[PDB]
C-alpha cells in the first residue's frame, strides 16, 4: 500500500504516508503546554503516524488565536516542548510544528465558549494586528490595528525565534502557518490587505511578507530538516482561477526559497465565499499545485477514509496525506488505516504492548 | 443505554458501567512504572471509561510476572505512580490497580520474548515460589519453592503494604488478584495445592490465604473505597461443576469479607483444559455468581462489541463490563459504542478538545 510507505525529505525519513496535521487543542495556559498536550500528542505518536505537527503555535502572545493556544515566544514557553518532542521521538513518529499568527483573527474565543471575537470589555482579550484595518467580519468584527513597519519587522522576528526554538526543542519539521485568514495569508490576500507601501497592492507586494519570513526562518532552521508551509490557495470566492494563478506562482517562489514540501489549503480569508466540501475535495487542487509548481504537497478535510488516503497517493495528487479529525476520534488510526488496506503485520503499527495482542 | 447508565460502588461513582480491565503493559523496569504506563494511562482515562483498573502489580519483586511487570514493593514505586493516578482523575476516570503475585508462573519472559520462564543461566530470572513443589508445566516447566508459614505471612504482608502504598497513592478502587493461576488461586486449587498443613487439604485450609489476605488488605484499605477482587471461579478441567460450587462458597466468604465487587474470570491453574473461548462465554458464569453470592460482579472476553456489552447488562449478567483488547486497538472504544448505541451527545463521552468537533 502507498500508505504506509516511507517518505524521505531532506535527512527525515517518516515510515509512512499519514501525517497529523496541527490541531489546536485550547488547553494551553499563557502559552504554556501542559500534560494535555504531552499525553495527547505522544499518544498520537504511539498511534503510528509517520509525522505529527503540533497545533499553530504563536510566536508572540497577540498571534494567538484565543486564551487556550500554544505558545513559543520565549525560552520557557519551548522549554515546555521538550519533554513532549522526546516522546514523540521515542514512539518513532517525527515531531514537526505548526508556527503562526492569527493577525485580525486572534483573541478569540475558544470554539466551544463562543467561537468570536471576546468582549471589549473581558480581561482576557487583546488588540489584533493585521496588514490593514479591516475586519474579517460575521464572528469576527474586531477591526485590527494596521500594522507599522517596524511591526512587520518585528513578527518577522518572531517568527525566527519561534523557529529557532522549535529547532532547539529537537523539533525535525517545521510548517510555518500562511493559511486560513491568519496574518500571513491576510498578507497574500487583496481582501485583506489594502497597503500601498511595499507590503502591498502588487503581487510582489503582497508576496513580500511571505516570502521575506521565509527567508529570514531559513537562516535559523537547519537546511538537513524539511522547512514546509501551509497555505491557501483559493478562496472559493469567485476569483478562484485568478487567486490559483497568483498562489501557484508564489508556491514556485517558496520552492526557489528553499520550501520542501507545501500543505495546500483555503484560505478562508473573508466569509462571504461557497466552499464545495467533500471527501477529499481538495485532491484535485493539491495535485494542480504539485504539478505547476513542481513541490511536494499534502491536503486534508476527509481523508479518514483509508481507501481515498491510498487513492490520492497512488494517482500522485499528493506525497503526504493528513488525517485529523479521525486522529481526535481514534488515536490509532493509523491501525485502522492498515487493516483496511491489508497490510501485512497490520498490528504492528502498534507498539509491541499492544501489537502482540491484536494480530 | 444500560451502558451508559452510572454505578456507584461505596463513596465511588464511576460515570458509566465501562472497566478497562487490568492489562500488563511489560514496560517496567525493576517495577518502576514510566513514561509508557503514564500516556497509556492517561489516555485511555481520557477516552471516557468510568473505571480504569491498572495492571498487575507486584506486592513483592518475586511476584513479577516478568522482568517488565510493574511493582508495587517499596514506597518509591508507589509515588511513580502518583501523577498517573492524579492525570486519570483529571480527565474522570476512577483510578483503580490490581495488586498481585504471579506464583509459580513468575520469572517469564515477555510474551513477544518467548512468553517461557526464564533460563536458568539468564541473569533476569529468579525463584518462583508457590504453595506446592509443583510446576505448571508446558512452557512454564520451573518448580517453584514450596512456602514456608514465615513465606505466608511475610506476602500476605507484601498485599497489605501493596494496599496501602495504593491508598496513599490515590487509588480508588483496589483489585486482588486471585486469578489465573497464580499465587491465590494456586492456593485455592487442589491441582495446585498439596500442603497439609493449615493452608491446604480441605476447602476451609485452601481457602485460608485467600480470606486472610482480604482481611488484611480491609484494615488498610478504606471502607469508603471498594475493595474487589479477581477470582478464576472454574478451569475448563471436568470438574467444573465441584469448582463453580467451591468458588461460589468462597465468594460468599468474600462478601462477608468486606469485598464490594467480584471480577470472575477463569483459573488458568493447569494447562491441560479446554475451554470454550467464545464472544461474551463467561456471561452466564459470571450471572450464577452474581446471583448466588448476590455479589456484584464484573467479567470479560469478547465484549468490545458495544450491543453485547449493553445485552449483558440489561440481562443483569454483570454489573460493570470489562473491555480490555478493544481498548489497545482504540484507546476511545467508550466514543465508538456510545455512538454504536445511540447515546445521545455521544461525542461528549471525550473531552471537549475532541468532543466539539466531532459532534
Ligand atoms: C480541532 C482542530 C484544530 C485545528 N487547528 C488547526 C491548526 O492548528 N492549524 C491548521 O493549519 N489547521 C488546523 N485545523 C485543520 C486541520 O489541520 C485539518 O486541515 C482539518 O481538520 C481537515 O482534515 P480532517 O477532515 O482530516 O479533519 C484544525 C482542525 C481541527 C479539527
Ligand atoms: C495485554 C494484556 C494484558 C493482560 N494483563 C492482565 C493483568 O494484568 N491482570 C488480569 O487479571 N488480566 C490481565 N489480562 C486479561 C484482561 O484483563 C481481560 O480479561 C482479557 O483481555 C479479556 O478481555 P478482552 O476480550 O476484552 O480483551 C490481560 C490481557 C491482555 C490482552
Redesign the pocket.
Known amino acids: 500500500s502507498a500508505l504506509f510507505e516511507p517518505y524521505t525529505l531532506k535527512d527525515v525519513t517518516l515510515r509512512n504516508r499519514i501525517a497529523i496535521?496541527?490541531?489546536?487543542?485550547?488547553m494551553a495556559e499563557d502559552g504554556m503546554i501542559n500534560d494535555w498536550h504531552h499525553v495527547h500528542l505522544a499518544g498520537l505518536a504511539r498511534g503510528g503516524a509517520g509525522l505529527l505537527?503540533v497545533?499553530?503555535?504563536a510566536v508572540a502572545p497577540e498571534g494567538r488565536?484565543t486564551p487556550g493556544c500554544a505558545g513559543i515566544w520565549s525560552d520557557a514557553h519551548a522549554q515546555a516542548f521538550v519533554p513532549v518532542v522526546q516522546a514523540i521521538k521515542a514512539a518513532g513518529s517525527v515531531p514537526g510544528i505548526?508556527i503562526?499568527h492569527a493577525g485580525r483573527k486572534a483573541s478569540a474565543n475558544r470554539?466551544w465558549e463562543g467561537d468570536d471575537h471576546i468582549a471589549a470589555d473581558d480581561t482576557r482579550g487583546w488588540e489584533t494586528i493585521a496588514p490593514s484595518a479591516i475586519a474579517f467580519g460575521a464572528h469576527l468584527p474586531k477591526v485590527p490595528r494596521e500594522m507599522t513597519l517596524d511591526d512587520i519587522a518585528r513578527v518577522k522576528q518572531d517568527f525566527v525565534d519561534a523557529a529557532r526554538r522549535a529547532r532547539d526543542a529537537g523539533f525535525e519539521w517545521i510548517?510555518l502557518?500562511f493559511?486560513?485568514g491568519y496574518l500571513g495569508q491576510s498578507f497574500f490576500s487583496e481582501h485583506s490587505n489594502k497597503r500601498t507601501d511595499a507590503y502591498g497592492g502588487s503581487f510582489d507586494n503582497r508576496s513580500r511578507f511571505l516570502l521575506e519570513t521565509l527567508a529570514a526562518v531559513r537562516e535559523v532552521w537547519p537546511e538537513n530538516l524539511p522547512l514546509t508551509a501551509?497555505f491557501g490557495v483559493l478562496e472559493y470566492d469567485g476569483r478562484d482561477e485568478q487567486t490559483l494563478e497568483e498562489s501557484i506562482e508564489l508556491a514556485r517562489r517558496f520552492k526557489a526559497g528553499g520550501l520542501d514540501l507545501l500543505?495546500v489549503?483555503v484560505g478562508f480569508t473573508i466569509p462571504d465565499t461557497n466552499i464545495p466540501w467533500g471527501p477529499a475535495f481538495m485532491g484535485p487542487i493539491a495535485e494542480r499545485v504539485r504539478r505547476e509548481a513542481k513541490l511536494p504537497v499534502t491536503?486534508?478535510?476527509?481523508?479518514?477514509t483509508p481507501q481515498l488516503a491510498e487513492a490520492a497517493l497512488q494517482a500522485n495528487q499528493l506525497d503526504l496525506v493528513?488525517?485529523?479529525?479521525?486522529?481526535?476520534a481514534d488515536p490509532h488510526w493509523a491501525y485502522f488505516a492498515a487493516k483496511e488496506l491489508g497490510v501485512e503485520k497490520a498490528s504492528w503499527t502498534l507498539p509491541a504492548p499492544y501489537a502482540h495482542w491484536l494480530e
Chains 1, 2 share one sequence.
Open positions: 496535521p496541527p490541531m489546536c487543542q485550547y505537527v497545533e499553530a503555535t488565536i505548526q503562526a470554539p510548517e502557518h493559511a486560513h501551509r500543505s489549503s491536503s486534508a478535510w476527509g481523508f479518514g493528513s488525517v485529523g479529525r479521525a486522529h481526535l
